[PDB]
Design a protein around this ligand. Structure first.
Ligand SMILES: Nc1nc2c(ncn2[C@@H]2O[C@H](COP(=O)(O)OP(=O)(O)O)[C@@H](O)[C@H]2O)c(=O)[nH]1
Ligand SMILES: Nc1nc2c(ncn2[C@@H]2O[C@H](COP(=O)(O)OP(=O)(O)O)[C@@H](O)[C@H]2O)c(=O)[nH]1
Ligand SMILES: Nc1nc2c(ncn2[C@@H]2O[C@H](COP(=O)(O)OP(=O)(O)O)[C@@H](O)[C@H]2O)c(=O)[nH]1
Ligand SMILES: Nc1nc2c(ncn2[C@@H]2O[C@H](COP(=O)(O)OP(=O)(O)O)[C@@H](O)[C@H]2O)c(=O)[nH]1
Ligand SMILES: [Br-]
Ligand SMILES: [Br-]
Ligand SMILES: [Cl-]
Ligand SMILES: [Cl-]
Ligand SMILES: [Cl-]
Ligand SMILES: [Cl-]
Ligand SMILES: [Cl-]
Ligand SMILES: [Cl-]
Ligand SMILES: [Cl-]
Ligand SMILES: [Cl-]
Ligand SMILES: [Cl-]
Ligand SMILES: [Cl-]
Ligand SMILES: [Zn+2]
Ligand SMILES: [Zn+2]
Ligand SMILES: [Zn+2]
Ligand SMILES: [Zn+2]
Lengths: 369, 369, 369, 369
């Protein structure tokens, strides 16, 4: 009826019968073989956590938020959270790689829910219409204001998805700045005018959350080496799937880290990809800057001199505060930046990197600056 | 010879023989009877830590920083850290009330070191000249470059004094928002051009340190009730020291928290002081705002209707980053804001408060809206 | 209506209107001036926490346990927990000192509840009969099986009193072994046959709790120096109160740490007490042993040779597991030691100490072993 | 020259050039593909940590212990710590299945060090003789007293190997019951009479270490489902290595977790193995008891009615304290139980389990009661 799972992020996650049935299905079990952070373990060696544990964590936090917000459709929203990652391919930024292969561009999460045993499991407790609702909610495609609130609980600025992965990524990578008082923040959330908002008692908790998110992006998600390994990985994965066909969902489901890593370790047609990823031959950071003009002028000089195939450019950006968070004050709604100098200080992260083939690095360095 | 003291911040603090002799003296033991945060325990109940434990913590953090920086004169700077608080008067913001009531203005820390057994104790290990250098170092008044480096270790922006109190204040108040473990920050410190600077590998640790400091200010030091209690206390302390004579250092040494409180709890002349501070009859916050114009305008309308005696004003304007921290880059020494857009962007804290006698509070409220 | 208090042990403690009224009374405020651990700060310098914060913590944990156990009289039990320490005198083991003074030997907690403004505050919400019930519950003097369950929630083996002070004492003294997963233990508690019992899912949590309790006793409560300072303190306090009269409860209420410490610091008739406690002249540990026979034979030799006034003996004992804890298993109640080798291993702590005047220590050492 | 690796257990692990050259070799990188705890992640989902991170942690803890103990041959013992796992075969309890399938029985750790690039790498820094000493030290087979001391640092009861895995296993499994920070224990270690011993000031830290180890055994290593999964895995692994030839070391090196799992997930011969391990069809626990007689009697009645193939038995009998740890007292060297009644009293863990095919489980249950 209820089973407990140890999770070092929370203590224990209690899961009821519907979640357990889903957990034991083949598509959910597959997530144990998909690292949350892809190749990041090559930089942060303890980053071994998988999408399976993250999905359990999302279910847990979704439950907590639904409890705090007194949401009526609690069980349906918890399952939406649990199943949020079913269609995630192995690695980072590789949904954009898979989608253009299949003719429909149908989201893989929607497909795994509707085309596998997951669909049958859900029907035990829900109508097909409620299942369509859970698909909209989990994919962030609400059709009305009711679904919008429920979807925000998982995918919003305070969503259970983000709350779990920020803390889980911090815990495994070893980044103490990524922790925030999730418990206190959840307790200060309110529904107001069909929005999830923060009570003014939660203003420090909100600051801490936004700042923790800043640290995770600068330290881990935008780490210069994590990014170039991902660049090499995606170029490889583009080749591997180039003639693969996803009309059969089982060709998606057979995609896990090990499958891709094995093709890389064994086929000699991919030796170059293999070296760039696994033998420390990734292109080397020539420039990392917050100054777009400096980046652009260096990029231009390099491309005048070096062939394009020997360089890579990466422009990364993330709003730390997107201007759309309300704080419920004594005098009604206000925007968080009106009340917080810290939130008021927050600007988008903008980082520009140039990487070069290890053979040309010295030449590119001296003949360019 | 070497004794260990339990300290929940650090595990144990190990102290050598010179430090123990100093710890055992009466002017150091006095610090056990002066709360680090004065009356803050009336708002944050667990803020019971004293200047005694803080001083042991400063000694321990000074040791650590000297170890990281490979400082020659380690023992002397450790002792300068240890004795840094000898001249502190009970509660907060009290130095400025005692100095005018003393003819020459001499710093009480220097007086306690020179006019009590502390001097004889230090003379066992240090020359007359090194004791004068210890005094300058501890007061932040160096006369040369060696003294300036050593003084920076204790009193600088991330000096051992601040590193200990920010962490200890958070630990005892219960402030779960900052990350307060500066082991990483300490490890990335360097001496360059005779300054304590941060290596670029410590940029994130420096960001975390400045954010943790912002949280302590907004949550604790500038808490609106903490501030009004201190306003009441300081008014009283001035009456109590109308014209006390500090020519005899023992009249300073007898000032501890219990002495001040007893003088209050007992005398019928000081009854309204007692009520405002200890019977929860402090002036009530009418306005707390970040807008100087709203403050100025409310102050005007208010002083039209009510007498000055029945109101108190408080202006807090505090820099979260002072523009004077160096980071050692591969390109040489930079200002921290030159390398961290986030630090470059941290805004100052600006808060304006108006407090009114609790009897007139409802009267003042509706008469202003 | 609800006020939040920061407590580093829990985050925030939320207190309703009845608790707030009680908190702001003179007898509850007095507890801010009574250190939980008495003179232990002379050994563990950060042990500055007071009975005021402990009482708030007891209220908080009582609420949590009542919630987990679905107790009907939740509010009355929470207040019983909040008011549990009202009659605690300053220091350790000094209730046994005060009781024989007053003619009635009435418990001081009962007296403070019934003879001060506390009584009037409680009547706002409860009948005098319910107030008598709260007195029985808080003092562990239940009159029937209903009251017995409620009283166990506060004063039992898993009581909220113990759960708070073990963790609070660990947090402030700096003893990491004294922490246990209080949250998990509370969640596995059950009421069965009018007893608080532990579900079998909580068996590890129970082991951890009992072991944490072991560490606190060996490291802190029975620390050899903590004990001899308490021995000197109690002998002093016996003198101070010898002719004091407690028929007026205000003579109890004026007893706080500062009052006693001041009599000690200022009256020269007590110079010897003062030195033994505050000038490092406490009797020195000559023998500390688990072997009663070795203790007894050494005690006899010393008393043949030295006058009794120059030695002190201390026999300390504590059951770590008292054989009276039930675990609700699949096949009904069992005793914890049937299921746990760790609990099965636990024997009473038995420690025997001899202390001697610092003048006779060397003579006692050589002329005795 | 010196590189830093994030490790959530320690902050960062700093490695010098000899260690980096070893870390970058293929036999060391293999360890990234072998989970520390085998199949435990099927019960404790976050148990994803690998032998790679564990080996870096052993290197780091070895460094720390050499620093505390002032060990001359620090670099050599650190490298012995680093390479300790080179010969580990994927999953748990697998050494004993590989050794009989290899003619001479030579330890695979020694083979990997001598028969791969590891040897050439070590020869850059160490003589032929020091490499033979490193091998003995790491295998716990010393030939003299220096080698024995160094080997104790890694493989002893509180060796760096155990200190790291107990803490790392707790951190990733989520075991909140022990205290697993052994900084204090390390600081109290001494070398006496050429043994690693504990100073009496570390008696409590030693008690905590042994209790923390008890918790890991009862909660994780002896978890009834963890044990049955390993029983199924080991039966399969034996079939897979019926007669594989390990004369070529590359046939050992190609054994990682994914290789074993692939061999299973794919071949139709191994289908019931696959189901028992990966499709939650493991034999179900019929009996778990501490009573050998109940075990023996249930085993008998059971084997009367059901065939051997449909049942599995497991006997676990593990010493929580082995009687062979020394504590340096003021009276000289003692056994730990001579000084700690609690350690003297810790009982062994004894657990007997009977598991049955999940089809026959209800049939076996009521036929036995
Ligand atoms: N060399 C090496 N570094 C690793 C490994 N795993 C994690 N790391 C860390 O991640 C970083 C990888 O960057 P690297 O490829 O060496 O390029 P770098 O930025 O010039 O040092 C290193 O600095 C290490 O701190 C590993 O297996 N080998
Ligand atoms: N009333 C009261 N509040 C306390 C006490 N100790 C700490 N606090 C905390 O102090 C804060 C504000 O106190 P209060 O005097 O009631 O000011 P106000 O509520 O802002 O008008 C609240 O967070 C209380 O939780 C106490 O003894 N009495
Ligand atoms: N000397 C000294 N020790 C203190 C003080 N506060 C805490 N301690 C600690 O508590 C212990 C007190 O014991 P002490 O009176 O010195 O007798 P000891 O057991 O022989 O060291 C010391 O070992 C210190 O670790 C203090 O003010 N002075
Ligand atoms: N059913 C199931 N349990 C899991 C899984 N991963 C971890 N667990 C935990 O594994 C434990 C026991 O698993 P199970 O196979 O159901 O054995 P049983 O419940 O004791 O018969 C429970 O604590 C689960 O919470 C999973 O994928 N499926
Ligand atoms: Br569920
Ligand atoms: Br209440
Ligand atoms: Cl939680
Ligand atoms: Cl990736
Ligand atoms: Cl995010
Ligand atoms: Cl010293
Ligand atoms: Cl103050
Ligand atoms: Cl809590
Ligand atoms: Cl005491
Ligand atoms: Cl107790
Ligand atoms: Cl090295
Ligand atoms: Cl295994
Ligand atoms: Zn997600
Ligand atoms: Zn200070
Ligand atoms: Zn209590
Ligand atoms: Zn190992």
């Amino acid at each position: 009826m209820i089973k407990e799972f140890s999770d070092p992020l929370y203590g224990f996650v209690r899961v009821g019968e519907a979640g357990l049935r889903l957990i034991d299905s083949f598509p959910f079990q597959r997530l144990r073989y998909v690292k949350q952070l892809g190749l990041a373990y090559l930089v942060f060696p303890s980053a071994q956590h998988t999408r399976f544990e993250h999905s359990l964590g999302v279910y847990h936090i979704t439950e907590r938020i639904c409890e705090s917000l007194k949401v009526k459709e609690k069980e349906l929203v918890k399952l939406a959270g649990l199943l949020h990652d079913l269609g995630h391919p192995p690695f980072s930024h590789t949904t954009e790689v898979l989608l253009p292969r299949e003719r429909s561009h149908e989201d893989f999460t929607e497909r795994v829910i509707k085309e596998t045993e997951i669909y049958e499991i859900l029907k035990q407790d829900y109508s097909h219409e409620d299942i369509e609702r859970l698909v909209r909610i989990t994919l962030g495609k609400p059709e009305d204001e009711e679904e919008k609130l429920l979807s925000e609980i998982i995918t919003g600025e305070f969503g259970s998805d983000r709350m779990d992965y920020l803390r889980r990524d911090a815990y495994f990578c070893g980044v103490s700045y990524g922790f925030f008082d999730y418990d206190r923040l959840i307790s200060t959330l309110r529904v107001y005018e069909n929005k999830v908002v923060v009570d003014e008692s939660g203003l420090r908790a909100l600051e801490n959350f936004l700042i923790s998110r800043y640290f995770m992006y600068v330290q881990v998600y935008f780490h210069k080496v994590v990014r170039i390994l991902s660049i090499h990985l995606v170029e490889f994965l583009k080749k591997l799937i180039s003639q693969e066909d996803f009309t059969d969902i089982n060709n998606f489901l057979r995609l896990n880290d090990a499958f891709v890593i094995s093709e890389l370790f064994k086929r000699k047609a991919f030796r170059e990809d293999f070296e760039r990823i696994f033998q420390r031959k990734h292109f080397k950071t020539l420039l990392s800057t917050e100054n777009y003009e400096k980046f652009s002028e260096t990029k231009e000089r390099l491309l005048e001199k070096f062939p394009q195939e020997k360089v890579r450019f990466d422009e990364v950006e993330k709003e730390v505060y997107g201007g759309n968070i309300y704080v419920l004050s004594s005098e009604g709604l206000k925007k968080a930046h009106e009340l917080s100098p810290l939130i008021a200080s927050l600007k988008p992260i903008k980082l520009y990197r140039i990487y070069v083939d290890r053979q040309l690095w010295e030449k590119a360095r001296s003949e360019l600056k």
